[PDB]
């Protein structure tokens, strides 16, 4: 739970994405919610202005505003405000979801993908199984920390990371589980950087290695932070007076959900 100095705007996006084994993009789906937390009653009679970049009338996003929000004012002036012009938001510091969106992209379209993935498999001499290379490239601006790759086998023999061909080679097996499978953590994927995670693992046949899933999370606190799809705040403002600015912080985040290769 982030700390709130009066107004805290959380822009949270969840990315689903799917690839073939060779890295060909099958599909993606991005979901978003803008959350508002207010804890000082003076600030609760407020209006948010969205960044000049964002197109609120772009229908591919299916922008839906909370029922109490003035839908028309959102569409004309990119203003989060209330129907009842004299009502206020709660000052109770509870997370109020006021705007949502969802966008999808088709096969071979990378516009919603923060982390592209490719896999290669050839058989191994060191175990009854396969030498795997997972190649990845972030197009994010920040670093990802503690990315987890899960391979849905529970082997008998422990997994051997290839420390030579893995980019971020303190990479380690964190667990091996009968239902959840085998999870490898790598500590960093740096901004706009291609890497690779090489290892060897015991499996009865190639198809048992799939689906491979990845798990990751980016968070950034900053007034000028932009979400992965370009959601951002321009200002916050007294509902009754649009020149009178108000103090506020923004968190933007991006976490994966169904993010996989098979």
């Amino acid at each position: 739970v982030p700390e709130n100095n009066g107004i805290l705007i959380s822009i949270k996006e969840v990315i689903n994405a799917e690839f073939s084994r060779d890295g060909t993009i099958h599909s993606s789906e991005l979901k978003g919610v803008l959350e508002l937390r207010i804890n000082d009653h003076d600030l609760s009679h407020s209006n948010l202005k969205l960044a000049d970049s964002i197109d609120v009338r772009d229908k591919s996003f299916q922008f839906k505003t909370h029922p109490n929000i003035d839908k028309q004012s959102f569409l004309s002036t990119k203003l989060i405000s209330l129907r009842d012009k004299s009502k206020a938001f709660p000052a109770n510091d509870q997370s109020l979801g006021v705007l949502r969106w969802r966008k999808v992209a088709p096969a071979e379209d990378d516009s919603l993908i923060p982390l592209t993935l490719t896999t290669a498999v050839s058989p191994s001499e060191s175990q009854q199984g396969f030498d795997v290379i997972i190649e990845y490239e972030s197009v994010l601006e920040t670093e990802l920390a503690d990315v987890i790759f899960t391979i849905p086998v529970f082997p008998q023999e422990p997994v051997d990371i290839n420390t030579e061909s893995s980019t971020c080679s303190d990479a380690e097996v964190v667990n091996m589980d009968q239902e959840m499978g085998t999870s490898i953590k790598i500590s960093k994927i740096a901004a706009n950087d291609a890497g690779a995670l090489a290892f060897t693992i015991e499996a009865p046949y190639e198809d048992a290695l799939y689906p491979m899933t990845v798990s990751f999370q980016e968070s950034t606190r900053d007034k000028l932070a932009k979400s992965f799809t370009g959601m951002a705040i321009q200002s916050v403002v007294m509902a009754n007076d649009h020149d009178q600015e108000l103090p506020y912080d923004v968190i933007t985040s991006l976490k994966s959900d169904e993010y996989l290769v098979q």
């Binding site: 029922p67 109490n68 509870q94 979801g97």
Partner: peptide, 5 residues
């Protein structure tokens, strides 16, 4: 869905 207020 949406939180009432």
């Amino acid at each position: 869905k949406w939180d009432d207020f």
